[PDB]
Design a protein around this ligand. Structure first.
Ligand SMILES: *[C@@H]1O[C@H](CO)[C@@H](O[C@@H]2O[C@H](CO)[C@@H](O)[C@H](O)[C@H]2NC(C)=O)[C@H](O)[C@H]1NC(C)=O
Ligand SMILES: *[C@@H]1O[C@H](CO)[C@@H](O[C@@H]2O[C@H](CO)[C@@H](O)[C@H](O)[C@H]2NC(C)=O)[C@H](O)[C@H]1NC(C)=O
Ligand SMILES: [Cu+2]
Ligand SMILES: [Cu+2]
Ligand SMILES: [Cu+2]
Ligand SMILES: [Cu+2]
Ligand SMILES: [Cu+2]
Ligand SMILES: [Cu+2]
Ligand SMILES: [Cu+2]
Ligand SMILES: [Cu+2]
Ligand SMILES: [Cu+2]
Ligand SMILES: [Cu+2]
Ligand SMILES: [Cu+2]
Ligand SMILES: [Cu+2]
Ligand SMILES: [Cu+2]
Ligand SMILES: [Cu+2]
Length: 496
């Protein structure tokens, strides 16, 4: 794909991924946003050029490179009012970082308000030249990235505060109930070959239960973390998660429905909604007529494990860490709260507050939403599900880190010995107590938030201000970053 060194010019333009025309955000004149690729170890220099003129979809922008640790480049992480002020329309801003020791499937998306819902979001693959799973597949390239996305006929700031999707897009295409003739995505395979498919959820809200008629899927990666291979016949993937799965194109040459059932909006497949086409070379260019069978080996997160079976940080019992934090979810005044506070973006980005002299979490805004974390410590965070935070299951995402999911949704057990590690986790449903652990090896302020973008917008976030005293020294910032806030703050309000 493009990158690791590339311009990304952001503009507004008409699109019709489901047959319906609407204005959306393009990236290098493309919708959906294009795939960016590099290799493990690469330096990425992604020059984001903000050419948008549409105020309703936000003329300013900021982009987060989801899944990348950004060690020593916290200023490049993307979240507006946490790690930067937005880039202003008519300006450009260079994200320049490296990706030491990561490889897998990632994505990028606007991290200003609900802007990515308007279409600034695309996949990223960082290949590993020594990928330990290479021996399982023959093909892994542009054409094996499979994105899922929600799509709305009304823009993020035009529809309901928490909208319902008119379509599910698979690789940027799909049908709405009003567009049953729209083009479907087609994914081609050749009989006898093995494919590393990289399934990326670009969704702003719904999760999708993904399956392919007549085929199983061997999962080998979760959110950029190599797993032990696990055969499954369906994958519930939440907003912002990734999986690689190997598909062996070992069935009869034909067309087979690829299905992505969301948890809200239209949940059926009538007339080819929520669907795409797996077409073996030599198949007729027509719609599949395959029928779905019940999933009998769904992916189960607590059954996943890392390739090395790496233990969770800290000691194998509850609270065996340096610092344990429970995040009690709630809702009040139409905003989400975590431990009683709703995140509201501060005028001065949290990172800039720290570089300006804020010496502890008590000094940081917004008050009540910022947690201090000590350096080089084992952290445990528990995220108990509650109906008091409406719109569960909420997929929580921690910036700056991968974490061990010691307890998954739908499971009553704790696993300190060999739990899956990942960066987005469903916190599930009342009764669940999803719990995660990570080591504070990455000084900086890092967002922790529900990745349903309408819920983030409603305050469902906190900031982990990790090792505040070393932030400035570990994250020296470039001049162009220092100029972001003065430029943005000089703007007319409707350009912000
Ligand atoms: C900027 O983007 C917005 C949102 O995409 C466009 O909003 C449309 O406005 C018309 C008229 O008010 C409505 O009938 C549409 O439903 C809106 N579209 C969507 C997708 O919400 C707006 O038109 C764009 N501005 C320009 C100049 O094109
Ligand atoms: C989810 O798990 C967390 C962490 O184990 C629980 O919070 C702990 O509960 C015990 C018993 O009340 C206290 O002694 C601890 O001090 C709490 N730990 C922390 C870090 O605050 C939490 O109660 C569980 N919540 C639900 C709803 O099941
Ligand atoms: Cu204008
Ligand atoms: Cu993200
Ligand atoms: Cu992220
Ligand atoms: Cu370091
Ligand atoms: Cu400028
Ligand atoms: Cu907002
Ligand atoms: Cu067509
Ligand atoms: Cu330890
Ligand atoms: Cu310790
Ligand atoms: Cu949520
Ligand atoms: Cu880390
Ligand atoms: Cu680490
Ligand atoms: Cu985020
Ligand atoms: Cu203006």
């Amino acid at each position: 794909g493009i990158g690791p060194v590339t311009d990304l010019t952001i503009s507004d333009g008409p699109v019709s991924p489901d047959g319906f025309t609407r204005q959306a955000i393009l990236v290098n004149n493309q919708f959906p946003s294009p795939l960016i690729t590099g290799n493990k170890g690469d330096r990425f220099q992604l020059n984001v050029i903000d050419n948008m003129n549409n105020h309703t979809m936000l003329k300013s922008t900021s982009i987060h490179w989801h899944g990348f640790f950004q060690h020593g480049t916290n200023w490049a992480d993307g979240p507006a009012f946490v790690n930067q002020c937005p880039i202003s329309p008519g300006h450009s801003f260079l994200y320049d970082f490296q990706v030491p020791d990561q490889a897998g499937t990632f994505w990028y998306h606007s991290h200003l308000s609900t802007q990515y819902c308007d279409g600034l979001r695309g996949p990223i693959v960082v290949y590993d030249p020594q990928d330990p799973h290479k021996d399982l597949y023959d093909v892994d390239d542009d054409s094996t990235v499979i994105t899922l996305a929600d799509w709305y006929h009304l823009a993020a700031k035009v529809g309901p505060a928490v909208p319902t999707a008119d379509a599910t897009l698979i690789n940027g295409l799909g049908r709405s109930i009003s567009t049953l003739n729209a083009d479907l995505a087609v994914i081609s395979v050749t009989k006898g070959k093995r494919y590393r498919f990289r399934l990326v959820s670009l969704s702003c809200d719904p999760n999708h239960t993904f399956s392919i008629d007549g085929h199983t899927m061997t999962v080998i990666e979760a959110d950029s973390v190599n797993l032990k291979p696990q055969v499954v016949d369906s994958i519930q993937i939440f907003a912002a998660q990734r999986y690689s799965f190997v598909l062996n194109a070992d069935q009869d040459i034909g067309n087979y429905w690829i299905r992505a059932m969301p948890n809200s909006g239209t949940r059926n497949f009538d007339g080819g909604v929520n669907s795409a086409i797996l077409r073996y070379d030599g198949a007729d260019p027509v719609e599949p007529t395959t029928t779905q069978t019940p999933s009998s080996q769904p992916l189960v997160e607590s059954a996943l494990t890392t390739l090395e079976g790496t233990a969770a940080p800290g000691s194998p019992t509850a609270g065996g860490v340096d610092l344990a934090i429970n995040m009690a979810f709630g809702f009040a005044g139409g905003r989400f709260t975590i431990n009683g506070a709703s995140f509201t973006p501060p005028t001065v980005p949290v990172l800039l507050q720290i570089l300006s002299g804020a010496q502890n979490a008590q000094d940081l805004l917004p008050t009540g939403s910022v947690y201090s974390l000590p350096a080089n410590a084992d952290i445990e965070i528990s995220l108990p599900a509650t109906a008091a935070a409406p719109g569960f299951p909420h997929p929580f995402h921690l910036h700056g880190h991968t974490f061990a999911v010691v307890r998954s949704a739908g499971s009553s057990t704790y696993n300190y010995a060999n739990p899956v590690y990942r960066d987005v986790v469903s916190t599930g449903s009342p009764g669940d107590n999803v719990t995660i652990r990570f080591r504070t090896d990455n000084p900086g302020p890092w967002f922790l938030h529900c990745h349903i973008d309408f819920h983030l917008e409603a305050g469902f976030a906190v900031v982990m201000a990790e090792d505040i005293p070393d932030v400035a020294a570990v994250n020296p910032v470039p001049q162009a970053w220092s100029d972001l806030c003065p430029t943005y703050n000089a703007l007319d309000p409707n350009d912000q």
